[model samples]
Target: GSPAFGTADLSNCEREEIHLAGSIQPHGALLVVSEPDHRIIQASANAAEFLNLGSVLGVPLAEIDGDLLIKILPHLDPTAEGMPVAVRCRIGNPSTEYDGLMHRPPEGGLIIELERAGPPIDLSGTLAPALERIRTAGSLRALCDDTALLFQQCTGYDRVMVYRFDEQGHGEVFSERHVPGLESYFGNRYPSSDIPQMARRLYERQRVRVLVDVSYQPVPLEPRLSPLTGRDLDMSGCFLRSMSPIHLQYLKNMGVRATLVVSLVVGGKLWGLVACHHYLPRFIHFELRAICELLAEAIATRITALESFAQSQSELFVQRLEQRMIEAITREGDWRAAIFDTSQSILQPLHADGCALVYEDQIRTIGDVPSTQDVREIAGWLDRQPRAAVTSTASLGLDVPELAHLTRMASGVVAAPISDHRGEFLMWFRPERVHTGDTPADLSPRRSFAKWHQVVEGTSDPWTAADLAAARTIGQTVADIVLQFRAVRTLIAREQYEQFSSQVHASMQPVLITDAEGRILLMNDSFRDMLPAGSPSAVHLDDLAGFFVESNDFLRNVAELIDHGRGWRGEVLLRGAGNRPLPLAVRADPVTRTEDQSLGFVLIFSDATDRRTAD
Candidate 1:
């Protein structure tokens, strides 16, 4: 539950209804009028909608609603009974817009004047019922679908949908609420290419986008800041315009008239969009739209919920499989187990599937995963050179002529690397077994039991169409879930590193330094490791007379420079532990930390000789 407020006392409202009404657009035009004499109070920008006739102020309360006047009059200034007091009203469309309660001190009354009853969005009436349903939901995933369904019912749109992007920037329709006569788009995958880089960036910047009309033209307003006289001005911000001409064309081809997109920010990163597509152009009130935005926020909050019970329950069913992968990482065993496990999950819901982890050379095949060369040849789609991230099906390249036969076996596939640093791939292949065009794999077996692969031909088969489309979404969702989890991994690593560094700074090995003239400064564990055991205690580099013995020419040269007031650094072999020369890497510095004082010279060395020998 959100933070609660004290009881609504008109005297203690912090800001009175009049102030709120003033904050509304077109400030004082549509103030709410009181009972008896109808004294004006709160106003609305949409006063024109309330008063069918012009200028509705100072009108008698009985003229509008005699019943409302009776309820509001007693609540007004009790001391001055003769003077009329204003009451707030509700507004609605095609109905009594708003009918909310009004009270000052003692007796409260009904004020239906400012309220709209267009479509009863009795937030209180709907809240408990929706909350009951959402709270009782089996999982957050189910709640996502339920919320979308409720929104679809409210909006009357053809399709109310949710699209989540994977770490690789590919998106797939995860769930949908489609009305009758509208095509099922439940599992469709929109390629990363479809939403280009610029489009994605715009989504991050503008959390909500309403594309009212794909064909809407730009209405250029005059730019007052233009330096060039009579030059065309940029009207991208003020003048309502669709984001991209390419996107507009794409939507037009899809037969979509409008779109409403609300960004889903999960774990502080822009995750994806709760996208709604309207077959016909639609305009929604700002208040009604804000409810959708709130719903999206709640859904994301549930995703990032911190409650231990909820987190533990979520981990049990849906996340159990993914958790196993994390366990594998912790065990420091074979990493392929992660991808191998995912392949089994994909196969449970699919057939003729392929799962492979791609690295520089050795491709680790888990199930019936295909080869890189085969994918490239068949699809003719160019993929980037092998690296440590998942490759989206959009770039999987499935257009080979000979591959037309296998298209009957599979439509496309999704591949992800096991780790960002590990160049291995974890891929899921989706098979399509319909003999659509000319099947080069004509001899492949076809069963009488209606197969899903048949729908790839764009056939109007109901079951096949719904199932395959839904299957495509599953493939995409898998990719996105993997990506989101990967982001969590990266964030965890960064947090751990920050904490680790802070702890290490105050440890015993904390680094500091000293100079060649035996000054007590510049000392670090790594640097101290190069110092002699008891003999050179509190002694600087130059204080040791034989520091550069005969054979140590490199140090001898640097010692000569230090004697002439220049700091010197080179390699030295110090006799240690067993009088045997322990090779040491030495760096000398004559440095100043701040303004005035100058330290003589400082030397730093590590037991680098062991590392050099190993090399």
Candidate 2:
């Protein structure tokens, strides 16, 4: 059986309603007051003792103290739908000044938390030098290291950790600073399951959560549920809201007493966290916590700029590589041969061990690659899958038993089908990632939080979203050039079209050539790949219009090309494999034998669907 404070194992921990904790910490007092009348409908069980009040429940707030809360009424309006607002007053018989935070949760009524006010804090002056250290660092890694040290110094916590999440949603101790006794968590990686998704969402909204004395007794609300809503209150906005018992237990297991966690929201997403740990029962009031939150905003912005700057560098190198491929088509008859000329262009950009290309039933490889026969076998396996612009896997051995021999050299592979043809493709490979790191493999509360080591094998480094993005760009560039090569082969065989074709071939486009009678002669493989699978061959140039949804303009433009030898350039919707139509930019011109002598037409089709849809 479960009480209002329910039982939880790992199975149900994810759905735990941490927001409806229905309690507050003992260090502070809480009161929920109704509007217009200011009647205290609900209060923390310890509110009477903490505030030195007499039977406060259901009593008018004015009856308790006319001089204390009356002056703070104006400040409560601004915080109705916003973050917590601060109000201070001296009250109670012995007369002690209390620091109060007032805010209205989604449910009605004002929720006020009162803590004995500390010395007047100069928040800006304390963080002034700390923020300077954050921005002046040389790099991202350098900045975070300093941030951990600065936070530990400012909060006077036993340790401060800069925890960052990886692409897999798991987190690592990216950097940390702590007191003399504790061991480092700098390289320790924890499972994503350790932090439930709902709590991650709460962290995003709250921005800051505090726990003072993990061993403290929970002070339940005086009447369980609020009298106004007859439901547990949402204390998401409350600074003194009680921490989850499971989380408190989690900290105690790790030898922690108190914590101050601040969120690092980079680029509108929960990027990382700045977690402070205190070994003894400790409390930091709103003034110091506010300073920590302000510095966190600056840290988040710096992280965004640093990551964008690195990605920008990769894109620049990709542009240079594309430029070289296009130039090679004009320089050499075989653009495929030049891909392996400067190997770094392909290898360094994607951080691959090696890459191989399949062209005209032959294989060419550069850098560390498997045998040619094995590469051929890998290519054959890729052909059997449903064709896509790109295909990737981190565990090739586990996925395909036939290619299991290539696991050590190519455990991770990202392959792109250059065109519809099975013989044409590009593949980048990464070797198996077998290494040791600072942690024993498994999940549990660390009984001895001392660092341990772990060894892992078989799987390789996973392909990231950005990695696939760069691959698509390179694949598209190679696809256009291969199609242009086919265009040259068709024109070279017939001298009549060769005179004008060479000049346009240098532009590297998907070309189609036809006879004067408007009969189909040649269309590049790239253009063929764009058509729906099992598409019937078109006898005439205009007959291909059947694949389009509406092609009256296509025929009209072609008629003008055959009869008048005029140039036509426009866009048309060509049906794709899934019966969905994609827009193709078309360029057609008359292949003239002489003045007013239109022998045939040369057409170029540009399919930008791949590039346009990537982002």
Each model's lDDT: 0.47, 0.76
- Model 2: per-residue Cα lDDT over 438-471, one tens digit each: 2222233342222211211355677877788778
Backbone clash count for every predicted candidate, in the order shown: 49, 0
- What value does the lDDT take at residue 401 in candidate 2? 70
Clash pairs (backbone) in predicted model 2: none
lDDT of 1 by residue, 1-615 (tens): 211121223232222121111122111122334334464332333455444434344445555542455555565654655322334443222323333323231121112223332353555556557655655556656867887787786666678887766554546577888878866767655434445454455566445567766665432211212222322222111112224444454577668888888778877766677778887886555456657667667766665552234435333423444555557553673333554544335343333255544544566554554556764443233243543233333222244344454453235655444434443344556544233222212211121112223322421111222223334444334345556666776887899977764554444432335444444454545445544545555344434435434354644554554455455545667545566666665555666645344555545454455454543
lDDT of 1: 0.47
Task: Kindly state the number of residue pairs that clash in model 2.
Answer: 0
Best by lDDT: 2
Candidate 1 stretches greater than 4 Å from native: 1-121, 125-141, 213-217, 224-243, 305-615
Candidate with best TM-score: 2
Worst 10 contiguous positions by lDDT, candidate 2: 447-456
Model 1's number of clashes is 49
Off by over 4 Å in 2: 1-6, 66-72, 75-81, 122-129, 337-345, 365-378, 397-411, 431-459, 485-493, 496-615
Model 2, residue 254: C-alpha shift (Å): 1.8
